[PDB]
């Protein structure tokens, strides 16, 4: 083995709302016990940066260490396609190990968002399925949530993005509710957040 | 480096259709380039059964070969949860790497199949989307297809299976047709194959 590096990007929600603070997470794994001195170097677009908050190595069950540095990125810096490079140098490795991560290259396409009622055959048991189709968006970074009457609906699952034929992405959100509420006539909302949307937000609803 | 070994299961369609041939495959990546020899014995519930038509070694770009064995398996055996073990006897291995695979354990659940038509929001565009919701099935091994008037429709994408709240699986399949064809009045039908289906096959139909 040896020390291995993993670079995870921010959560799509984090970069689309100036409210949150998107961060890029470099994690060093299997740093050995003998020499566990690990240097972190951070570059944005090749230019070295130093506002990264490296954090105290945590020793693991396997008598192996694991360090994490967190670089907070600027929302527009991520959406303007900057490239974040985590360099990790260690005494137990032939050369420093590099990793770079970015938003997917390409032209952002805007998600179409529709809402699909339950079919009749399903209207036969306790709960039915309200479907939110989101298609035609690029890149795949996206967030989906449901609510109705202002409060969050929680019994819902969202499939991962799928590559469509034209090269954009689609997904579905399925929200499961009691057939009562569906037959009552309550309206439910599928809310989508994506960088190619005005205000990074749209909302589409659905009721009897 | 060294010789990593990966095992893969049959295609779901293959194990449900006596017509088709289901087979397990043992991949061997990053093979020594300065010793390149490999063995395989193959066991079903322990008992060696040897049939591994080792698809004659092949070569990939990066100093690395890729030998591959494939063993036929009985249809009912795989659905009866027997374990297929690939023991890649390699003499340049520190020790013989062993790996096992079996169908998911658990009580099979029958998929429910619902046809959802396009939204009217969607009807503006040159192509609309027909949705086949497939939910409630276990295990996740499943196959979805689209066809029109007995002939295969092919411009469709299917999301992977997703674990739902009750511990079953669901997915969705999207078929894209030019509004012309939908607006006339054609029937499109979504056919699903799953182990808990009568004859491993159902089909629900959709039309204007
Ligand atoms: C000793 O003990 C150690 C501790 O247990 C053990 O450490 C583990 O080593 C593993 C390697 O052997 C390592 O495995 C990798 O895991 C990656 C995913 O891990 C995430 O999800 C896991 C759950 O599945 C968690 O356990 C992880 O901690 C990690 O969780 C994520 O963590 C980040 C950082 O905290 C977090 O991001 C930040 O979240 C905050 C919070 O809100 C903010 O939002 C920030 O904005 C955000 O940055 C995530 O939220 C969090 N996610 C979740 C779900 O919790 C996995 O990706 C790795 O797979 C890649 O590499 C393998 C090769 O090893 C490939 O096979 C695989 O296909 C992947 O390959 C990559 O795939 C990419 C996409 O497909 C592609 O782009 C790349 O090119 C490709 N790279 C390739 C092919 O090289 C891998 O499985 C594991 O994480 C370690 N555990 C921990 C806790 O660190 C160690 O192994 C032990 N040693 C021994 C000898 O036993
Ligand atoms: C030099 O260049 C080499 C050539 O390119 C390169 O080779 C690759 O090395 C990789 C090793 O690092 C290796 O990556 C693995 O990929 C596994 C999945 O691969 C499938 O999909 C890949 C990408 O989509 C394809 O490239 C593969 O070929 C493979 O495709 C499958 O192939 C089989 C056999 O052909 C096929 O089955 C049969 O198919 C036919 C029709 O095709 C019929 O259907 C038959 O009936 C059927 O049996 C499949 O259909 C086909 N599938 C697809 C989708 O096409 C992947 O599984 C590996 O990841 C696991 O291990 C890593 C280890 O790091 C874990 O991190 C990761 O999380 C996965 O771990 C498993 O996860 C499971 C779920 O959570 C869990 O249950 C397991 O326990 C867990 N196991 C663990 C943790 O150990 C891995 O990514 C790749 O296969 C090699 N390429 C080829 C062509 O084999 C080499 O690396 C280069 N070397 C250097 C030094 O640069």
mmCIF file of C-alpha atoms and ligand atoms in Angstrom, chain A residues 6, chain B residues 1-2 4-12 14 21-31 55 59-71 99-101, ligand 2:
data_model
loop_
_atom_site.group_PDB
_atom_site.id
_atom_site.type_symbol
_atom_site.label_atom_id
_atom_site.label_comp_id
_atom_site.label_asym_id
_atom_site.label_seq_id
_atom_site.Cartn_x
_atom_site.Cartn_y
_atom_site.Cartn_z
ATOM 1 C CA UNK A 6 -8.602 11.311 -2.138
ATOM 2 C CA UNK B 1 1.936 -2.919 -8.420
ATOM 3 C CA UNK B 2 0.560 -6.385 -9.057
ATOM 4 C CA UNK B 4 -5.660 -7.291 -9.121
ATOM 5 C CA UNK B 5 -8.581 -9.726 -9.516
ATOM 6 C CA UNK B 6 -12.290 -8.881 -10.035
ATOM 7 C CA UNK B 7 -15.365 -11.079 -10.214
ATOM 8 C CA UNK B 8 -18.607 -10.068 -11.952
ATOM 9 C CA UNK B 9 -22.064 -11.647 -11.987
ATOM 10 C CA UNK B 10 -24.382 -12.526 -14.905
ATOM 11 C CA UNK B 11 -26.595 -10.096 -16.681
ATOM 12 C CA UNK B 12 -30.098 -10.143 -15.123
ATOM 13 C CA UNK B 14 -29.480 -13.847 -18.937
ATOM 14 C CA UNK B 21 -26.746 -17.977 -21.546
ATOM 15 C CA UNK B 22 -25.754 -16.596 -18.073
ATOM 16 C CA UNK B 23 -22.075 -16.516 -17.245
ATOM 17 C CA UNK B 24 -19.804 -15.388 -14.407
ATOM 18 C CA UNK B 25 -16.510 -13.730 -15.308
ATOM 19 C CA UNK B 26 -13.192 -13.496 -13.487
ATOM 20 C CA UNK B 27 -11.086 -10.557 -14.651
ATOM 21 C CA UNK B 28 -7.343 -10.303 -13.866
ATOM 22 C CA UNK B 29 -5.990 -6.800 -14.390
ATOM 23 C CA UNK B 30 -2.447 -5.370 -14.138
ATOM 24 C CA UNK B 31 -0.733 -8.709 -14.905
ATOM 25 C CA UNK B 55 -10.877 -16.253 -23.093
ATOM 26 C CA UNK B 59 -3.260 -6.996 -24.070
ATOM 27 C CA UNK B 60 -3.873 -3.387 -22.924
ATOM 28 C CA UNK B 61 -1.905 -0.119 -23.299
ATOM 29 C CA UNK B 62 0.328 0.366 -20.223
ATOM 30 C CA UNK B 63 2.784 -2.594 -19.844
ATOM 31 C CA UNK B 64 -0.192 -4.567 -18.468
ATOM 32 C CA UNK B 65 -1.994 -7.660 -19.757
ATOM 33 C CA UNK B 66 -5.505 -8.897 -18.874
ATOM 34 C CA UNK B 67 -6.322 -12.579 -18.775
ATOM 35 C CA UNK B 68 -10.007 -13.423 -18.290
ATOM 36 C CA UNK B 69 -11.855 -16.605 -17.529
ATOM 37 C CA UNK B 70 -15.569 -17.137 -18.007
ATOM 38 C CA UNK B 71 -17.618 -19.994 -16.658
ATOM 39 C CA UNK B 99 -12.882 -14.252 -4.526
ATOM 40 C CA UNK B 100 -16.551 -15.169 -4.268
ATOM 41 C CA UNK B 101 -19.876 -13.883 -5.631
HETATM 42 C C1 LIG C 2 -3.592 -0.344 -17.251
HETATM 43 O O1 LIG C 2 -4.759 -0.437 -18.172
HETATM 44 C C2 LIG C 2 -5.686 -1.459 -17.754
HETATM 45 C C3 LIG C 2 -6.660 -1.663 -18.883
HETATM 46 O O2 LIG C 2 -7.503 -0.526 -19.013
HETATM 47 C C4 LIG C 2 -6.342 -1.094 -16.429
HETATM 48 O O3 LIG C 2 -7.334 -2.072 -16.097
HETATM 49 C C5 LIG C 2 -8.390 -1.835 -15.087
HETATM 50 O O4 LIG C 2 -7.907 -1.958 -13.753
HETATM 51 C C6 LIG C 2 -8.872 -1.583 -12.750
HETATM 52 C C7 LIG C 2 -8.250 -1.918 -11.411
HETATM 53 O O5 LIG C 2 -7.740 -0.764 -10.760
HETATM 54 C C8 LIG C 2 -10.246 -2.261 -12.928
HETATM 55 O O6 LIG C 2 -11.225 -1.469 -12.253
HETATM 56 C C9 LIG C 2 -12.290 -2.216 -11.591
HETATM 57 O O7 LIG C 2 -13.514 -2.115 -12.292
HETATM 58 C C10 LIG C 2 -14.561 -2.945 -11.793
HETATM 59 C C11 LIG C 2 -15.737 -2.737 -12.693
HETATM 60 O O8 LIG C 2 -15.260 -2.844 -13.984
HETATM 61 C C12 LIG C 2 -16.321 -2.981 -14.916
HETATM 62 O O9 LIG C 2 -16.576 -1.735 -15.433
HETATM 63 C C13 LIG C 2 -15.372 -1.064 -15.867
HETATM 64 C C14 LIG C 2 -15.688 0.389 -16.147
HETATM 65 O O10 LIG C 2 -17.096 0.518 -16.321
HETATM 66 C C15 LIG C 2 -14.835 -1.809 -17.073
HETATM 67 O O11 LIG C 2 -13.659 -1.177 -17.456
HETATM 68 C C16 LIG C 2 -14.536 -3.271 -16.666
HETATM 69 O O12 LIG C 2 -14.067 -4.034 -17.783
HETATM 70 C C17 LIG C 2 -15.756 -3.947 -15.928
HETATM 71 O O13 LIG C 2 -16.721 -4.310 -16.910
HETATM 72 C C18 LIG C 2 -17.344 -5.566 -16.601
HETATM 73 O O14 LIG C 2 -16.696 -6.652 -17.232
HETATM 74 C C19 LIG C 2 -17.285 -7.938 -16.989
HETATM 75 C C20 LIG C 2 -16.445 -8.958 -17.733
HETATM 76 O O15 LIG C 2 -16.214 -8.604 -19.092
HETATM 77 C C21 LIG C 2 -18.753 -7.959 -17.416
HETATM 78 O O16 LIG C 2 -19.324 -9.159 -16.906
HETATM 79 C C22 LIG C 2 -19.834 -9.917 -18.000
HETATM 80 O O17 LIG C 2 -20.256 -9.030 -18.992
HETATM 81 C C23 LIG C 2 -20.724 -9.685 -20.152
HETATM 82 C C24 LIG C 2 -20.956 -8.547 -21.136
HETATM 83 O O18 LIG C 2 -20.134 -7.407 -20.872
HETATM 84 C C25 LIG C 2 -21.970 -10.501 -19.809
HETATM 85 O O19 LIG C 2 -22.876 -9.629 -19.285
HETATM 86 C C26 LIG C 2 -21.623 -11.526 -18.718
HETATM 87 O O20 LIG C 2 -22.812 -12.285 -18.380
HETATM 88 C C27 LIG C 2 -21.027 -10.759 -17.520
HETATM 89 O O21 LIG C 2 -20.645 -11.673 -16.488
HETATM 90 C C28 LIG C 2 -19.531 -6.773 -16.860
HETATM 91 O O22 LIG C 2 -20.796 -6.713 -17.511
HETATM 92 C C29 LIG C 2 -18.781 -5.462 -17.094
HETATM 93 N N1 LIG C 2 -19.459 -4.356 -16.439
HETATM 94 C C30 LIG C 2 -19.577 -3.144 -16.989
HETATM 95 C C31 LIG C 2 -20.282 -2.112 -16.160
HETATM 96 O O23 LIG C 2 -19.143 -2.893 -18.114
HETATM 97 C C32 LIG C 2 -14.911 -2.533 -10.394
HETATM 98 O O24 LIG C 2 -15.767 -3.528 -9.843
HETATM 99 C C33 LIG C 2 -13.676 -2.374 -9.501
HETATM 100 O O25 LIG C 2 -14.082 -1.610 -8.392
HETATM 101 C C34 LIG C 2 -14.223 -2.476 -7.254
HETATM 102 O O26 LIG C 2 -12.966 -2.669 -6.706
HETATM 103 C C35 LIG C 2 -12.336 -1.419 -6.336
HETATM 104 C C36 LIG C 2 -10.941 -1.714 -5.906
HETATM 105 O O27 LIG C 2 -10.331 -0.460 -5.747
HETATM 106 C C37 LIG C 2 -13.185 -0.712 -5.244
HETATM 107 O O28 LIG C 2 -12.603 0.517 -4.861
HETATM 108 C C38 LIG C 2 -14.577 -0.467 -5.802
HETATM 109 O O29 LIG C 2 -15.360 0.181 -4.814
HETATM 110 C C39 LIG C 2 -15.169 -1.802 -6.232
HETATM 111 O O30 LIG C 2 -15.179 -2.541 -5.025
HETATM 112 C C40 LIG C 2 -16.317 -3.413 -4.927
HETATM 113 O O31 LIG C 2 -17.593 -2.746 -4.782
HETATM 114 C C41 LIG C 2 -18.718 -3.632 -4.614
HETATM 115 C C42 LIG C 2 -19.952 -2.765 -4.475
HETATM 116 O O32 LIG C 2 -19.823 -1.796 -3.444
HETATM 117 C C43 LIG C 2 -18.509 -4.568 -3.420
HETATM 118 O O33 LIG C 2 -19.564 -5.523 -3.403
HETATM 119 C C44 LIG C 2 -17.162 -5.278 -3.507
HETATM 120 O O34 LIG C 2 -16.923 -6.031 -2.324
HETATM 121 C C45 LIG C 2 -16.041 -4.261 -3.699
HETATM 122 N N2 LIG C 2 -14.753 -4.921 -3.814
HETATM 123 C C46 LIG C 2 -13.649 -4.481 -3.208
HETATM 124 C C47 LIG C 2 -13.805 -3.260 -2.348
HETATM 125 O O35 LIG C 2 -12.571 -5.050 -3.338
HETATM 126 C C48 LIG C 2 -12.502 -1.679 -10.174
HETATM 127 O O36 LIG C 2 -12.852 -0.296 -10.235
HETATM 128 C C49 LIG C 2 -10.694 -2.516 -14.369
HETATM 129 O O37 LIG C 2 -11.605 -3.614 -14.371
HETATM 130 C C50 LIG C 2 -9.521 -2.840 -15.300
HETATM 131 N N3 LIG C 2 -9.961 -2.895 -16.690
HETATM 132 C C51 LIG C 2 -10.445 -4.007 -17.266
HETATM 133 C C52 LIG C 2 -10.841 -3.881 -18.708
HETATM 134 O O38 LIG C 2 -10.557 -5.066 -16.654
HETATM 135 C C53 LIG C 2 -5.238 -1.039 -15.385
HETATM 136 O O39 LIG C 2 -5.781 -0.587 -14.150
HETATM 137 C C54 LIG C 2 -4.096 -0.062 -15.794
HETATM 138 N N4 LIG C 2 -2.982 -0.185 -14.875
HETATM 139 C C55 LIG C 2 -2.183 0.849 -14.523
HETATM 140 C C56 LIG C 2 -1.060 0.517 -13.612
HETATM 141 O O40 LIG C 2 -2.347 2.025 -14.943
#
